[PDB]
């Protein structure tokens, strides 16, 4: 129920808009992910993982 | 040119040479040739490298 | 590709031969760059930037 997207953006020198444009999503979608308002679709989680060279479980943590 | 920060930037960005090559749609030997200065990049490729790292071209390459 | 070399020549009242002489390239090389005929090597882009006192990104435009 949380993620490391904000921290990873800083590590990769990306603004929210930069990350959004690289994933073909809007800047608001990126901000919604970082604040947890929107849970990503699985395809968007995959796109994030490949962009950062990580597995989904490296970026997103969830309960269950 | 031999003087460039591609290797250092790769380490900062969690990239192997092959990872960087795939992100730029070039081959792995092209990346190695760029880092060692054996190849000078085309201007379009220099732009793609600069935009990937969010930097100016002059931040990555020295003339 | 796309660049402002021709606009910069006009702003500084330079002929193609003037710019060629200042950069040690041929006049045909200058014309190919201004018309978008040739994409320059990075060393040539630097020399253009240094001559005009500008950044590479100030002179050249690229789709990525």
Distinct helical segment count of chain A:
5
Largest interface: B-C, 15 and 16 residues
**Assembly classification:** homotrimer
Q: What general form of chain A does the structure show?
A: globular
Strand percent estimate of chain A: 5-15%
Order of helices and strands of chain A: EHHHHHE
In which order are the strands of the major sheet of chain A placed?
1-2
Protein name (chains A, C): Transcriptional regulator, PbsX family
Keywords (chains A, C): DNA-binding
GO molecular function (chains A, C): DNA binding
Pfam family, one (chains A, C): HTH_3
Provide a concise account of the structure shown:
The structure is a homotrimer. Chain A is mainly α.
Describe this structure in words.
The structure is a homotrimer. Chain A has a single domain, classed as lambda repressor-like DNA-binding domains (434 Repressor (Amino-terminal Domain)), CATH 1.10.260. In chain A, helix 2 packs across helix 3 (27-35). Chain A has five helices and two strands. Chain A has 64 residues and is mostly helical. The relative contact order of chain A is 0.21. Chain A is globular. Chain A has helices at residues 5-11, 16-23, 27-35, 42-52, 56-59; strands spanning 2-3, 60-61. In chain A, 61% of the residues lie in helices and 6% in strands. The longest helix of chain A is centred in the last third of the chain and has 11 residues, at 42-52. Chain A has a two-stranded antiparallel ribbon. The interface between B and C is medium-sized, with 15 and 16 residues. It is classed as unknown function. Keywords: Helix-turn-helix motif, unknown function. The assembly is trimeric. Crystal structure of putative transcription regulator (dr_2454) from Deinococcus radiodurans. Chains A, B, C: Transcriptional regulator, PbsX family.
